[PDB]
């Protein structure tokens, strides 16, 4: 499973996996710790710039995250790790196979709750020690005492008491003596969230049937009850800017605000996060400011701000609605296609099954941007035909990009699922272009290609026709008709002279683009699934249906190499920039490197998730691959 | 931000400091009774003398004004400067001023209020500091000359931006622009808070309710096309109606009736909201004029209901309340008058309510059905219930008579209900 | 009145001066150690200084009534009756969605002079001066052509 040429680098395009993020304050500034699968990222609350990432990938997925000043505690399986600046400093290993669920740190005590309703307490070896390491004691809540633990919390001004919140009721545990100080009355509804209020002795509890309870621990009595019918609470948080506001997040993807003083609703933010991915998994008011940070399972993190009231007097009643401030995001579902935008490791295009196309920056996450889909007005002046309700374009099946003419006109072509035309995009403006290319044979688009000069675009139809357009004006120039089955690949050499095509019928046609003549035709035994053309060496490889990669020299029109060994279909493959290697992935969950001079496999990997795409950087320093699972992109460094 | 923008903010904060003679000329020249040239020549003692006399006349009209002779119109108030006061003291000062603007809201037609208010304009500079309260209290006098004088000497807040053009303009602000100012949602929250204070203080008067109702009614009219914006108005203006119904003053209650009706016809609402709406209407219904208007509102609200349960019976608690505030004889008079509005859906729900909860009024049902013609489905529902009554309730001379009434009118439909039920 | 009492607090004795933050708790300079009950009470007072006590916690508690209308507004967020149950369509807003063309499967060569839906079956009939009777199976997604009938020299006016 360990490559001798490649090694993991990091994952691009993930901001949050849905686990509740943790907010930490250093001095005046704040930072947000978000979980990404087996590692966490730390963003600056001011600019949402990445600062640190976990040095090593955790063996198992992270379940809980808590941050106190420099130190960050990350829980996975039965181990709680302590991290500083993204480097592990110490590992806490619990003595029970039960997996940790929740994590609370107050004072010198670290409290870990396992799924078996057992709470483990650690203590600092020295009062001045930075983090707890020593094992103090174990507290277990039995079914008679209460139900499953919902979350651990510690209210302010409580000496060595831990407020254990269970589904049935709330409990108060004195960690120092390990004795149950107080037991709450049983509640009718199942509790799902707990948030300490800025007031004393009051903890906000959220039920599964839209009830928010301002339970008073000192009195052991209810103080208030907000009602949210037909909703499920997922997060609670209080505004500490001197205004008594409460933000109640819900699994449906809504965020409601209540003004406790006036017993009124300020506003509701609808569909900030997708309901399919858990809605508002976490929403936290920044301590003492009107900014609220919200997250969800849709791979996005947002910030909203309350502007000052617009009335000089009675600023309390006239509350401005929350305003979008900033955010970072990625794909909600795994990317379908990828490509390297520029010669350097500069930018990377990604299109996913969520119908969104993104331009990702390898060198700074802040630079990553979504390519907008707002259309140009037609040159003719006729009205554009489209549904009034705005919907994203279908999934991108194929993509081709060139940079010979970036900034002068369109330079990207994309093919869509079950769509009879290919759309154009402009990388410089980062928006859809103004040209649409039709196959003109009632056939779906199966292949797209661009000439190196950036003047022509080739569209391969499912009915066997190749249409050639001009990118500058989007006017059709030539149409080639040789294949009777779907064309699965098109390429043109650097000199814009010889053109090569491949189709499911198994024939590879060789064309002279200047003279528009058929130089020759080659029949292979099996249907051809994909094509990669190497312009520097004039060699192109074809992924045949019989689980082979056939390399052909366009100059002489003969098979030069044939590669065998894959046990299933070849999802994708690419040439190395120097033209010496081919890296291919297949459904059998492996990536193989093929040395073309010798025509043999020199390296092999076993990936847990099938590699749907593989792409070398033009430099050759980085290899990027995408998998059937995971919203991000896996980046590999080339040890060669 | 540029240096100029920050200085502009600094300039606004020190608007009333009177740093130099030129600044004093602008601040002291502002007046409601005197032109600029004569105003500058005047002294604080002269202005206070007229105001002290003016407040006395107001006190004769209404004793409550006499209290301010102790606080705002005292001889010691002459030496009181707002700038040198601390934050706590200013808030205390603003509460007194805000209270006065409420009393003066209804007496602006009297000349003494113009002389009583001049002291606050010159001494405490309310036209610069408490500009929002001053405009709101005088909002309904927009066609009067006094409002024109206020607009001239006043700097408009961001929310009152629509009135900017009518500053120092010969024409008074038009009724149409007044609708535009109310159209803004932030203004409605601002006005609602002000109107809430009036309800708390029993400071309301007829002219305020009339003007407040019209703008509220007109706003719904302007947003009738936009259903989404109507949805945003429901939390605010209905919440106002709840407050208005709480006022013991009958005039406030009638305004709530006027406001509530327009929403129901403008926007269909859940039967839960309509049912709750009645309970507030009937909870504090004491004045006869309110009782007349309320009953008109009750029937209109049901007429808007257009969903399953459109004519289902009233809940038990609601029915008892309605009967107490409206005896059967009263409604028989209501159905008697020829100009009665369409109320059949309510009468159907009321009619089915009688059968479920009262057995003594069954004779009243017969009288009601004759007075008002019910629509085909409503008649069918009533027959369906009375069939159930016969099987459960003992057969009575009145009960069979109600059937006999249906035998006379549309005998075939009576069989259809019987066929479906038994 | 406290529902619970913790005896550990009365016994424990903490030093204040060890850390910078706690030093502000001292009432006098001489003291250096205070028992737990006083230590908590000092923390509570200091906590209020960081977060002032708002009005809602103390003065207000929940623990025909006129305020029914106000209560129902709080619980309900969508104030419009669901039009699904109502059998009577809204006056001014029409909920209309377009589907695929009926003629897309097999186009007509003249104006559609008349249309007719079959009383029960899902068929649509089109006729025109093209002199043809084209019947379509209106399914809303495909609309294929069931049959056709050309009537020579018989313009279809209806």
């Amino acid at each position: 499973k360990n490559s001798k040429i490649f090694s993991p680098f990091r994952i691009i395009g993930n901001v949050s996996n849905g686990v509740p993020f943790a907010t930490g304050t250093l001095g005046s500034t704040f930072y947000i710790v978000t979980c990404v699968g087996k590692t966490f990222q730390i963003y600056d609350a001011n600019t949402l710039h990445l600062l640190f990432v976990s040095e090593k990938e955790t063996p198992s997925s992270i379940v809980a995250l808590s941050a106190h000043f420099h130190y960050v505690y990350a829980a996975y399986e039965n181990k709680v790790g302590i991290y500083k600046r993204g480097i592990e400093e110490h590992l806490l290993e619990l003595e029970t196979d039960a997996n940790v669920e929740h994590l609370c740190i107050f004072g010198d005590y670290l409290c870990a709750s396992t799924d078996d309703n057992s709470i483990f307490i650690y203590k600092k070896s020295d009062p001045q020690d930075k983090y707890p390491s020593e094992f103090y004691t174990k507290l277990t809540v039995t079914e008679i005492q209460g139900g499953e633990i919902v979350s651990l919390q510690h209210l302010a001004t409580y000496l060595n008491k831990l407020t254990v919140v269970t589904k049935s009721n709330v409990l108060l545990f004195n960690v120092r003596t390990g004795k149950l100080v107080f037991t709450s009355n049983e509640f009718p509804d199942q509790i799902t969230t707990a948030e300490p209020a800025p007031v004393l002795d009051i903890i906000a509890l959220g039920t599964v049937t839209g009830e928010v309870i301002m339970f008073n621990m000192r009195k052991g009595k209810r103080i208030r009850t907000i009602k949210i019918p037909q909703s499920r609470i997922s997060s609670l948080s209080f505004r500490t800017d001197g205004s008594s506001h409460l933000s109640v997040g819900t699994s449906s993807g809504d965020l409601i605000f209540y003004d406790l003083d006036r017993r009124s609703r300020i506003h509701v933010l609808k569909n900030i996060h997708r309901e399919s991915y858990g809605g508002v998994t976490q929403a936290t008011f920044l301590n003492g400011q009107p900014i609220i940070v919200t997250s969800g399972g849709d791979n996005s993190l947002k910030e909203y701000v309350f502007d000052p009231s617009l009335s000089q007097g009675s600023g309390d009643v006239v509350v401005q609605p929350p305003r979008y401030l900033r955010s970072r995001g990625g794909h909600s579902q795994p990317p379908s296609y990828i490509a390297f935008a520029d010669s350097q490791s500069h930018f990377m295009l990604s299109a996913s099954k969520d119908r969104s196309l993104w331009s990702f920056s390898l060198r700074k996450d802040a630079q990553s941007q979504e390519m907008s889909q707002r259309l140009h007005k037609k040159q003719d002046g006729g009205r554009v035909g489209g549904s009034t309700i705005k919907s994203k374009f279908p999934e991108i099946v194929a993509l081709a990009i060139e940079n010979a003419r970036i900034g002068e006109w369109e330079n990207i072509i994309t093919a869509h699922k079950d769509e009879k035309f290919a759309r154009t995009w402009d990388m410089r403006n980062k928006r859809v272009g103004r040209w649409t290319f039709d196959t003109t044979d009632d056939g779906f688009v199966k292949s797209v290609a661009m000439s190196q000069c950036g003047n022509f675009g080739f569209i391969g139809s499912s009915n066997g026709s190749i249409t050639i357009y001009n990118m500058q004006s989007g006017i059709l120039r030539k149409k080639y008709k040789l294949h009777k089955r779907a064309v699965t690949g098109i390429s043109l050499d650097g000199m814009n002279r010889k053109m090569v095509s491949c189709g499911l019928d198994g024939i590879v046609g060789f064309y002279d683009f200047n003279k528009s003549t058929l130089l020759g035709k080659l029949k292979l035994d099996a249907p051809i699934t994909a094509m990669v053309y190497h312009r520097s060496s004039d060699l192109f490889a074809l992924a045949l249906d019989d689980l082979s990669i056939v390399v052909i020299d366009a100059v002489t029109q003969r098979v030069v190499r044939q590669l065998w060994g894959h046990s299933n279909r070849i999802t994708a493959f690419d040439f190395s920039p120097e033209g010496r290697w081919i890296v291919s992935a297949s459904l059998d969950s492996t990536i193989r490197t093929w040395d073309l001079p010798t025509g043999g496999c020199i390296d092999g990997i076993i990936v847990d998730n099938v590699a749907t795409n593989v792409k070398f950087s033009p430099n050759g320093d980085l290899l990027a691959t995408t998998h059937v699972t995971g919203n991000g992109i896996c980046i590999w460094t080339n040890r060669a | 931000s540029s240096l100029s923008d920050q200085l502009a903010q600094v300039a606004s904060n020190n608007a009333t400091v009177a740093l130099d003679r030129k600044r004093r000329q602008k601040l002291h020249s502002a007046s409601l009774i005197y032109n600029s040239k004569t105003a500058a020549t005047q002294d604080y003692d002269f202005i206070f003398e007229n105001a002290s006399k003016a407040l006395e006349e107001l006190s004769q009209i209404e004793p409550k004004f006499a209290i301010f002779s102790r606080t705002l119109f005292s001889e010691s108030s002459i030496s009181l400067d707002r700038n040198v006061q601390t934050k706590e003291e200013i808030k205390d000062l603003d509460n007194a001023i805000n209270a006065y603007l409420l009393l003066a809201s209804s007496k602006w037609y009297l000349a003494p209020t113009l002389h009583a208010t001049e002291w606050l304009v010159r001494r405490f500079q309310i036209h610069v500091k408490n500009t929002e309260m001053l405009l709101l209290s005088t909002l309904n006098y927009y066609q009067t000359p006094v409002f024109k004088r206020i607009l001239s000497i006043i700097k408009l807040p961001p929310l009152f931006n629509c009135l900017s053009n009518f500053v120092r303009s010969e024409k008074p602000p038009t009724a149409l622009t007044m609708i535009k100012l109310f159209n803004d949602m932030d203004f409605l929250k601002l006005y609602t808070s002000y109107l809430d204070q009036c309800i708390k203080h029993n400071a309301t008067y007829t002219n305020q309710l009339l003007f407040t109702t019209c703008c509220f009614i007109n706003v719904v009219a302007f947003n009738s096309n936009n259903d989404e914006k109507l949805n945003q108005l429901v939390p605010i203006l209905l919440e106002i109606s709840a407050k208005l119904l709480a006022s013991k003053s009958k005039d406030c209650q009638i305004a709530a009736h006027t406001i509530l009706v327009v929403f129901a016809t403008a926007l269909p609402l859940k039967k839960t909201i309509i049912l709750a709406a009645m309970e507030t209407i009937l909870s504090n219904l004491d004045a006869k004029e309110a009782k007349h208007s309320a009953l008109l509102t009750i029937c209109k609200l049901f007429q808007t209901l257009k969903g399953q349960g459109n004519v289902d019976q009233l809940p038990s608690k609601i029915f008892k309340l309605f009967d107490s505030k409206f005896d059967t004889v009263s409604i028989l008079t209501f159905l008697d008058k020829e100009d009665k509005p369409v109320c059949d859906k309510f009468i159907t729900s009321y009619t089915r309510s009688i059968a479920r909860y009262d057995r003594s009024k069954l004779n009243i049902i017969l009288s009601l059905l004759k007075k008002i013609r019910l629509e085909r489905y409503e008649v069918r529902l009533i027959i369906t219930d009375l069939i159930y009554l016969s099987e459960i309730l003992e057969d009575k001379s009145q009960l069979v008579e109600l059937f006999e009434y249906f035998i006379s009118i549309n005998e075939d439909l009576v069989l259809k209900c019987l066929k479906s039920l038994g | 009145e406290a529902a619970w009492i913790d005896s550990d607090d009365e016994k424990i004795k903490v030093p204040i001066l060890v850390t910078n933050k706690t030093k502000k708790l001292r009432t006098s300079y001489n003291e250096s150690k205070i028992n737990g009950v006083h230590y908590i009470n000092r923390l509570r007072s200091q906590f209020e200084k960081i977060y002032p006590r708002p009005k809602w916690v103390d003065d207000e508690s929940d623990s025909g009534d006129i305020n029914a209308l106000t209560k129902i507004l709080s619980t309900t967020y969508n104030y419009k009756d669901t039009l699904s149950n109502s059998k009577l369509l809204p006056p001014k807003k029409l909920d209309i969605v377009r589907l695929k063309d009926a003629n897309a499967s097999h186009p007509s060569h003249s104006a559609i002079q008349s249309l007719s839906f079959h009383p029960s079956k899902p068929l649509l009939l089109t006729g025109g001066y093209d002199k043809t009777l084209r019947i379509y199976h209106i399914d809303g997604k495909t609309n294929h052509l069931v049959t056709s009938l050309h009537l020579v020299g018989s313009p279809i006016q209806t």
Binding site: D108 | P158, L159, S164, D184 | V14, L43
Partner: peptide, 27 residues
């Protein structure tokens, strides 16, 4: 003119927060 709705720049302000470290004590 209708009400001007400008989005003013919002910059962070230092805010004091309670430290839970004082909560723990040892006998």
């Amino acid at each position: 003119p209708k009400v001007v709705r400008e989005a003013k720049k919002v910059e962070m302000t230092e805010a004091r927060a309670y430290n839970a470290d004082a909560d723990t004590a040892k006998a």
